[PDB]
């Protein structure tokens, strides 16, 4: 007998605490990240209206695919340029409760280079 | 009867307004002695009533004391002027409100129960009435 | 023995800060990087 | 404090001053006790005795003023306490030296075919003059120097403790407590002995690099004591020690229940230890100890 | 012996619900977070709630068992 906690639940406990000081507005939307075993997802979210303004993911059929780190960089670029079409420049990065180390960092760095300001 | 320990050595006398909060029905025994006036009951009075009941019952049946002297009270000795802090604790009282069943009995025929509770009532500073459990 | 001390600026020697330390836990002179209002820059400050 | 005269005059003047100070503090305590005793008598009297209660408060004021002008007696500086005991027992032949020759590469041979044999619970003095080989011989026994010729055999019952002349057994970088750290002793045991050597409380966390030569000598001695060896190879032990600590060192060694190989140019220290046999250098001469030591010194 | 007590600290609400206050106005003095700082409201070093802007004070619920003060400019 041994129970291994759900990693999503453990992450979401950290996410709530990240979100106590990070929240999206119309002029500074939240850049929320969801990371799976296979994929990574990005959403630009306005928490005041509770609506997502732009979105990209490794499932978009426009990302060539490869190492999960370099698909995160591909997602970061794609969400940044989709957000640019809607006039989004400034955002606050919501790391989703993940450590800002690897795939998430690759997505975040790719978003900075493609026009998002954060 | 005395509490083994108390959080505070000294306590307000308090007030006794209204009917008893709880313990207004016979709960364990067949007959109860209900207080019809409110009054402090001392642990000495509780004991006198208890012995008056049990003895007449001739160690027969069961007796429940439904009140406990939770509250302490102090006094000052003769020759002591007013002031200089609250007096030392002197005794223990249960504040009893009208409608509280002070005692219950069971295991004895009604004739003995009615006379048993009569003898106890004469030991208490409160007027009382016999109450049959419902 | 907790005591009150002054932290002097090692550059200009202005006695810039009032603080305190336990001498038993900090036998040596407390050294801190503190802003010197005279030089208007962060400088090494040492107990004098 | 600066006196005119010599060491004895300083001791005479100082001892008298501390005596006269001690008597002053005694009389000030008596007067405080007197007031205190009356204050208590009034304090416990009946509340109906108004005058005594009044006098009690008046004397309480004098008692307070007394206790605030009452000189504190300076705490007399504590002297070292040494209790050196061997864990095991000495043999009739603790150390065997046979036909041992040694020379420092490029220098004349210090001794040739040196052969001696210690007896056990013996005070063995290695006499000589400066630069004659005394410290070389002791280094030879421990193993620092490998003999050019001969053999040095220690009985399996012999545990050896070495006190080097130049205090080369301490880590200057580490603290006092770190130096004395041993696998055989727990923390509170180490602190208790260091307090016996006048290292009190956080004085043991001081770096050895900031201590004086005399305080370092105590740490080395403490290392020797903590070994509980039955053979003590001591090279000028009283060096750097204050005169009071020297007498303590000599007296305690005298009672040591083990063999002592000692070197000392201090005439007082050797007398206290009560040497049995003296080994003269460079002319090897295993001799019974006596005032003939002076004869060898003259010659 | 007894006979001691600290000076009272005048804690509690200092601005009313529906009242217009200037920025920096103290809304609530308290030990601990008996009431939480809401929109446009900050909490001081001793838990005092103060307005960050000019607006109307509203004491609101924070979920099930907590309260909250906010300031809403007009």
């Amino acid at each position: 007998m041994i129970t291994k906690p759900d990693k999503n639940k453990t992450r979401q406990k950290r996410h709530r605490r990240v979100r106590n000081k990070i929240s999206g507005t119309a002029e500074c939307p939240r850049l929320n990240i969801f990371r799976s075993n296979k994929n990574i997802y990005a959403q630009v979210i306005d928490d005041v209206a509770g609506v997502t303004l732009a979105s990209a993911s490794a499932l978009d059929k426009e990302i060539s695919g490869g190492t999960k780190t370099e698909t995160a960089a591909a997602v970061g670029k794609l969400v940044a340029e989709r957000a640019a079409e809607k006039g989004i420049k400034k955002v606050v990065f919501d790391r989703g409760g993940y450590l800002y180390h690897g795939r998430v960092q690759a997505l975040a760095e790719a978003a900075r280079e493609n026009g998002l300001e954060f | 009867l005395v509490p083994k320990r108390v959080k505070h050595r000294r306590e307000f006398r308090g007030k006794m307004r209204g009917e008893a909060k709880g313990g207004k029905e016979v709960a364990f025994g067949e007959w109860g002695l209900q207080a019809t006036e409110s009054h402090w009951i001392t642990n000495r009075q509780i004991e006198a009533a208890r012995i008056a009941m049990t003895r007449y019952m001739k160690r027969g049946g069961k007796v429940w004391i439904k009140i406990f002297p939770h509250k302490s009270y102090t006094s000052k000795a003769i020759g002591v002027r007013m002031g200089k802090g609250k007096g030392a604790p002197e005794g223990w009282v249960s504040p009893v409100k009208r409608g509280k069943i002070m005692f219950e009995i069971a295991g004895v025929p009604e004739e003995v129960a009615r006379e048993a509770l009569r003898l106890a009532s004469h030991k208490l500073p409160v007027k009382t009435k016999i109450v049959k459990r419902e | 023995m907790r005591v009150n001390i002054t932290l002097e600026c090692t550059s200009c020697k202005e006695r810039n800060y009032l603080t305190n330390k336990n001498k038993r836990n900090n036998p040596d002179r407390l050294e801190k990087q503190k802003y010197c209002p005279r030089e208007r820059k962060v400088t090494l400050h040492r107990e004098t | 404090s600066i006196y005119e005269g010599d060491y004895y005059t300083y001791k005479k003047k100082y001892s008298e001053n501390q005596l006269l100070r001690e008597k002053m503090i005694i009389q000030q305590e008596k007067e405080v006790k007197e007031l205190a005793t009356f204050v208590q008598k009034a304090k416990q009297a009946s509340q109906t005795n108004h005058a005594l209660k009044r006098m009690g408060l008046e004397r309480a004021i004098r008692l307070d003023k007394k206790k605030k002008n009452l000189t504190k007696r300076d705490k007399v500086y504590k002297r070292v306490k040494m209790d050196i005991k061997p864990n095991r027992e000495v043999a009739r032949t603790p150390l065997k030296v046979e036909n041992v020759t040694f020379h420092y590469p490029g220098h004349p041979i210090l001794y040739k075919d040196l052969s001696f044999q210690i007896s056990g619970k013996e005070r063995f003095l290695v006499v000589g003059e400066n630069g004659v080989g005394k410290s070389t011989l002791l280094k030879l026994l421990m193993g620092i120097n490998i003999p050019d010729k001969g053999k040095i055999i220690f009985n399996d019952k012999t545990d050896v403790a070495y006190y080097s002349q130049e205090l080369e057994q301490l880590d200057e970088e580490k603290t006092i407590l770190e130096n004395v750290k041993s696998d055989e002793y727990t923390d509170w045991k180490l602190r208790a002995t260091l307090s016996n050597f006048l290292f009190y409380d956080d004085d043991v966390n001081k770096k050895v690099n900031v201590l004086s030569p005399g305080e370092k000598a105590r740490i080395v001695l403490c290392k020797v004591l903590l070994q509980k060896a039955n053979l003590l190879i001591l090279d000028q032990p009283t060096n750097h020690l204050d005169p009071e600590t020297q007498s303590i060192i000599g007296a305690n060694f005298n009672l040591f229940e083990g063999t002592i190989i000692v070197v000392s140019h201090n005439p007082s220290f050797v007398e206290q230890i009560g040497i049995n046999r003296m080994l003269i250098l460079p002319s090897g001469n295993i001799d019974n100890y006596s005032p003939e030591l002076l004869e060898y010194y003259s010659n | 012996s007894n006979g001691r007590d600290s000076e009272s600290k005048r804690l509690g609400a200092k601005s009313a619900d529906g009242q217009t206050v200037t920025g920096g106005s103290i809304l609530y003095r308290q030990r601990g977070t008996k009431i939480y700082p809401g929109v446009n409201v900050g909490i001081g070093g001793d838990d005092t709630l103060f307005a960050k802007v000019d607006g109307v004070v509203r004491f609101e619920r924070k979920g099930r068992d907590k309260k909250q003060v906010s300031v809403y400019p007009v």
């Binding site: 007998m1 041994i2 | - | - | 696998d183 055989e184 002793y185 727990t186 923390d187 | -």
Partner: protein, 177 residues
């Protein structure tokens, strides 16, 4: 890898049949093994713990974590934070290697060995083994030891019950009484 090899090829198909497991993921496996040496003697002398830790490392091959008292106790002369106790957690291959040596080398060297207990289950399918003395492990050298000490070996498994854990451990090799 030998014991891991045995587990994947032999143990797994059998346990599925015995307990009628619909999916292979139900098969109990050894999650981790925690060897714990409770050394209260560190109070009297700190080095006894130091020598204990050295031997513990050689037995497992991992530097142990020195556990510390979470609470002060005057009866044991124990202060909160004092380093009493050491543990090692073995996972993956290092776990299987150790379990193999324990089954095939260590246990036979136990003085008058008549098997390991069969009631030593926590009720949840975790078995803990109390080694009375060292020197059963070949790494101890039988001469370095000054104070003979034992250890608590906790085998943690994913079995939901004692019965499955008992079976899993038996087929992996366990001289149950």
């Amino acid at each position: 890898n030998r014991l891991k090899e045995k587990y994947i090829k032999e143990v797994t198909p059998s346990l599925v049949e015995k307990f009628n497991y619909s999916s292979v993921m139900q098969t109990p496996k050894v999650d981790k093994i925690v060897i714990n040496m409770g050394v209260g003697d560190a109070v009297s002398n700190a080095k006894n713990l130091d020598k204990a830790v050295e031997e513990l490392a050689l037995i497992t091959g991992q530097k142990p974590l020195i556990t510390k008292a979470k609470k002060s106790i005057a009866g044991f002369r124990l202060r909160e934070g004092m380093p009493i106790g050491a543990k090692v957690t073995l996972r993956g291959e290092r776990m299987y290697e150790f379990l193999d040596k324990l089954v095939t080398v260590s246990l036979p060297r136990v003085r008058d060995f008549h098997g390991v207990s069969k009631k030593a289950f926590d009720g949840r399918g975790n078995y803990t083994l109390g080694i009375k003395e060292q020197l059963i492990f070949p790494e101890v050298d039988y001469d370095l030891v000054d104070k003979v000490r034992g250890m608590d070996i906790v085998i943690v498994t994913t079995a939901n019950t004692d019965e499955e854990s008992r079976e899993l451990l038996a087929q992996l090799g366990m001289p149950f009484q």
